[PDB]
Amino acid sequence: SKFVRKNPKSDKFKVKRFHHIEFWCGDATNVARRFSWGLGMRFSAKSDLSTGNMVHASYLLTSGDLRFLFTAPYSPSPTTTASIPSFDHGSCRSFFSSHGLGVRAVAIEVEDAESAFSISVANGAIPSSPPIVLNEAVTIAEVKLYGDVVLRYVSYKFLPGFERVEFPLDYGIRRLDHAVGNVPELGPALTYVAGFTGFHQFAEFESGLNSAVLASNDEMVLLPINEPVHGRKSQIQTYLEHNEGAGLQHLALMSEDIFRTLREMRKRSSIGGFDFMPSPPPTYYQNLKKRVGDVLSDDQIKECEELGILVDRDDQGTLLQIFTKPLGDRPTIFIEIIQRVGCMMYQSGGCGGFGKGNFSELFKSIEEYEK
Amino acid sequence: SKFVRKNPKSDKFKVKRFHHIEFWCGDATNVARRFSWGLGMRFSAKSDLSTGNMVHASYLLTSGDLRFLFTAPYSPSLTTTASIPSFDHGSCRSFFSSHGLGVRAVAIEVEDAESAFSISVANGAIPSSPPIVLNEAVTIAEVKLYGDVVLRYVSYKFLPGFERVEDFPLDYGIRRLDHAVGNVPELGPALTYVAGFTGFHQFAEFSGLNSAVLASNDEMVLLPINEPVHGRKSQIQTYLEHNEGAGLQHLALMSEDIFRTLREMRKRSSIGGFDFMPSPPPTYYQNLKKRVGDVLSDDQIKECEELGILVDRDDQGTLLQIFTKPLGDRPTIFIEIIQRVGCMMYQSGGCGGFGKGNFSELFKSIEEY
Numbered sequence: 198s199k200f201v202r203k204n205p206k207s208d209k210f211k212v213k214r215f216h217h218i219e220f221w222c223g224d225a226t227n228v229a230r231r232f233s234w235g236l237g238m239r240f241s242a243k244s245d246l247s248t249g250n251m252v253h254a255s256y257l258l259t260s261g262d263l264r265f266l267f268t269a270p271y272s273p274s275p276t277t278t279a280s281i282p283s284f285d286h287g288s289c290r291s292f293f294s295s296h297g298l299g300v301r302a303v304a305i306e307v308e309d310a311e312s313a314f315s316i317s318v319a320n321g322a323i324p325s326s327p328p329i330v331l332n333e334a335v336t337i338a339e340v341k342l343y344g345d346v347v348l349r350y351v352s353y354k355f356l357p358g359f360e361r362v363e364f365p366l367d368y369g370i371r372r373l374d375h376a377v378g379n380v381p382e383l384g385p386a387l388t389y390v391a392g393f394t395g396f397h398q399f400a401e402f403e404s405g406l407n408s409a410v411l412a413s414n415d416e417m418v419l420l421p422i423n424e425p426v427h428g429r430k431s432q433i434q435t436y437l438e439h440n441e442g443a444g445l446q447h448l449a450l451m452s453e454d455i456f457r458t459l460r461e462m463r464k465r466s467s468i469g470g471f472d473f474m475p476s477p478p479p480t481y482y483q484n485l486k487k488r489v490g491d492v493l494s495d496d497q498i499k500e501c502e503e504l505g506i507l508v509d510r511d512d513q514g515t516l517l518q519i520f521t522k523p524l525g526d527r528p529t530i531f532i533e534i535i536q537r538v539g540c541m542m543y544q545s546g547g548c549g550g551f552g553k554g555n556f557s558e559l560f561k562s563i564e565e566y567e568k
Numbered sequence: 569s570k571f572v573r574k575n576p577k578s579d580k581f582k583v584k585r586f587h588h589i590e591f592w593c594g595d596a597t598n599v600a601r602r603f604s605w606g607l608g609m610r611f612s613a614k615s616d617l618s619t620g621n622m623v624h625a626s627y628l629l630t631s632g633d634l635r636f637l638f639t640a641p642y643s644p645s646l647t648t649t650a651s652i653p654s655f656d657h658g659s660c661r662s663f664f665s666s667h668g669l670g671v672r673a674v675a676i677e678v679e680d681a682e683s684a685f686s687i688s689v690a691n692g693a694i695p696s697s698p699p700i701v702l703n704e705a706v707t708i709a710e711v712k713l714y715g716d717v718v719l720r721y722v723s724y725k726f727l728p729g730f731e732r733v734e735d736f737p738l739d740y741g742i743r744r745l746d747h748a749v750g751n752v753p754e755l756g757p758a759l760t761y762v763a764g765f766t767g768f769h770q771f772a773e774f775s776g777l778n779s780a781v782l783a784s785n786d787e788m789v790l791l792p793i794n795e796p797v798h799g800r801k802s803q804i805q806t807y808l809e810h811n812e813g814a815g816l817q818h819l820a821l822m823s824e825d826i827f828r829t830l831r832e833m834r835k836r837s838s839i840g841g842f843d844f845m846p847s848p849p850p851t852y853y854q855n856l857k858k859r860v861g862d863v864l865s866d867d868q869i870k871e872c873e874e875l876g877i878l879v880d881r882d883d884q885g886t887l888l889q890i891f892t893k894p895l896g897d898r899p900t901i902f903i904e905i906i907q908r909v910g911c912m913m914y915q916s917g918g919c920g921g922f923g924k925g926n927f928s929e930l931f932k933s934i935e936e937y
């Protein structure tokens with residue numbers, strides 16, 4: 198009858214919000230133009246040959262506060278002209294050859310990235326890139342998160358050496374909600390990240406998985422981590438094979454109206470955008486009526502059925518969510534579109550949870566639908 | 569007042585059509601999806617995990633008879649399951665790391681690919697992939713064209729291992745591939761190399777570059793080759809530096825109505841499609857009404873101006889063309905859309921040439937104005 202949650206607000210440095218996601222590409226242009234059309238994100242900044250960067254090509258797409266950065270190495274034929282200082286062709290080519298299209302870097306704003314970096318390394322973080330001040334403006338540092346993903350710190354006083362790009366595109370995507378990594382072993386990954394960050398544990402209510410969510414003090418930076426359960430097979434085990442180890446599994450994208458967004462995105466799956474996981478049976482939506490009846494009107498339940506949208510509830514609020522098919526060649530990274538309703542006071546982070554209860558709700562309605 | 573062409577029809581094996589182009593990618597899925605929307609090409613066939621292929625991902629777009637194959641290597645941890653028998657992980661990753669996104673293979677239908685291959689290698693051709701017969705249906709061979717591009721021979725009796733994709737659908741008028749142009753450091757050697765093993769003849773010409781066009785007996789397979797002229801800097805040199813050697817410069821796509829195609833493609837430039845080269849000044853389109861006004865109505869002139877379409881003439885016919893910006897990160901491969909008008913007798917290949925004349929016409933319209 199009552200679910201109680203604790204939060205020791207034990208961040209070791211001041212953390213603000215997600216800043217950007219950096220994908221490592223083979224060709225940044227075609228990936229950036231695919232994502233731009235498929236998600237309704239505007240071309241906003243660039244650092245390439247047209248701006249003087251002869252080391253790497255990097256395009257920034259934005260949608261409200263969401264920033265997707267796409268970076269590809271040029272031919273080596275030194276690094277002075279590069280704008281992102283942690284970059285080198287060897288690590289890029291290795292990453293791509295080993296994992297294919299995927300997230301290299303999850304970037305969080307912090308108060309002081311040099312502060313954030315030294316506290317992290319003192320508490321166990323494996324450094325990947327030390328603090329660099331770019332043009333006495335922004336400071337950027339990087340530490341290993343899991344596998345080949347880096348956590349990147351960004352602090353201020355898009356980036357120096359980027360040029361801005363001038364009715365544009367917008368399907369309602371407003372911000373990144375959470376970024377989820379797949380690891381072989383929850384326990385050590387958790388003690389390692391929680392060890393250097395001080396992020397606390399967020400709460401709960403076959404799956405093939407064990408999950409735990411790491412959260413900053415205000416629970417606005419959310420980092421869930423999944424482990425495969427051995428012994429139908431775990432998609433997470435499947436992820437680890439095709440991704441050649443740990444790596445980022447999915448990004449959830451918060452929308453201000455998931456119906457508009459889903460309408461826009463489903464218009465474009467067959468003309469260059471993203472395809473979606475097959476939708477629940479009709480029994481799943483008959484059961485919505487009185488499981489969230491008090492939050493969704495009957496017209497919005499008809500809307501979820503037309504769009505294949507999943508709904509979940511926890512102690513605080515309600516979550517509307519839908520999962521995209523893998524973004525590239527391998528069955529590795531995919532995207533989630535979500536809208537959280539409730540928990541207003543501003544809206545609190547994790548309002549509605551992460552959809553864990555939809556495993557049963559999907560299985561229940563699939564076995565209901567046969568009979 | 570008269571231009572005379574010769575054609576020794578000296579092909580050494582029977583050649584039919586441009587069959588497909590194969591791009592080698594980092595990620596086949598995004599490139600193919602981008603090309604699909606920008607060009608109006610249907611997802612036609614595929615060979616990948618969902619088909620059992622654990623070696624490479626390969627997607628086929630088609631528009632009319634034009635076929636674009638996009639191929640990328642999967643992880644080697646997971647080669648009999650591959651459907652393209654010339655594929656190996658190492659070569660692909662070296663290619664992409666050396667050249668970026670680009671064309672790996674120009675494929676032509678030949679009567680018999682093992683015959684075509686054996687005659688080529690005796691007459692100088694460097695082999696890359698020996699004849700392989702697939703499921704007793706199609707034979708496949710590759711010799712070296714220039715740089716890391718191979719000329720690929722296909723003969724029959726899309727490919728075994730490909731599953732068809734069901735699709736309302738996408739179509740902007742692209743109907744076939746017209747020519748495919750390589751950039752090399754030294755025209756002469758490459759010409760004698762390629763012409764030596766094909767028997768292809770020189771199709772004749774009615775700056776920054778020297779070019780010659782090798783054609784098949786019926787001149788339906790057309791392969792121009794560019795050389796940089798040294799000492800404004802040669803865009804062919806710029807190509808050679810950024811692609812790290814010889815490689816394919818552009819593919820010209822024949823459209824059955826370039827006006828239709830361009831309205832479709834320019835609408836999509838800012839929403840994922842392709843952008844175009846800056847268009848000529850207005851004097852270019854004023855000097856058109858007295859240069860091609862016997863072929864295009866005044867309303868078609870106004871249509872070329874609205875779309876930045878270039879027009880040239882030659883002895884037999886008239887060519888409508890326009891060029892795209894570079895397709896990937898590097899300023900290397902780009903696309904051209906063309907429509908040939910004239911030369912009916914079916915239409916003869918190369919009716920109108922290749923746009924040699926527009927260098928002069930673009931300069932002089934710019935000195936005017």
Ligand SMILES: CS(=O)(=O)c1ccc(C(=O)C2C(=O)CCCC2=O)c(Cl)c1
Nearest residue numbers: 377408421422533551552553555556559
């Ligand atoms: C197969 S499903 O029931 O529709 C479902 C639900 C939540 C999710 C995820 O967003 C959550 C969550 O985003 C964090 C990690 C634990 C999960 O499973 C996923 Cl990937 C799939």
Ligand SMILES: CS(=O)(=O)c1ccc(C(=O)C2C(=O)CCCC2=O)c(Cl)c1
Nearest residue numbers: 749779792793904922923924926927930
């Ligand atoms: C600079 S332009 O007048 O727009 C022009 C014309 C022809 C072409 C080419 O299609 C032809 C032709 O495709 C190959 C032989 C040499 C050329 O220049 C190009 Cl890339 C540009």
Ligand SMILES: [Co+2]
Nearest residue numbers: 749820904922
């Ligand atoms: Co051309």
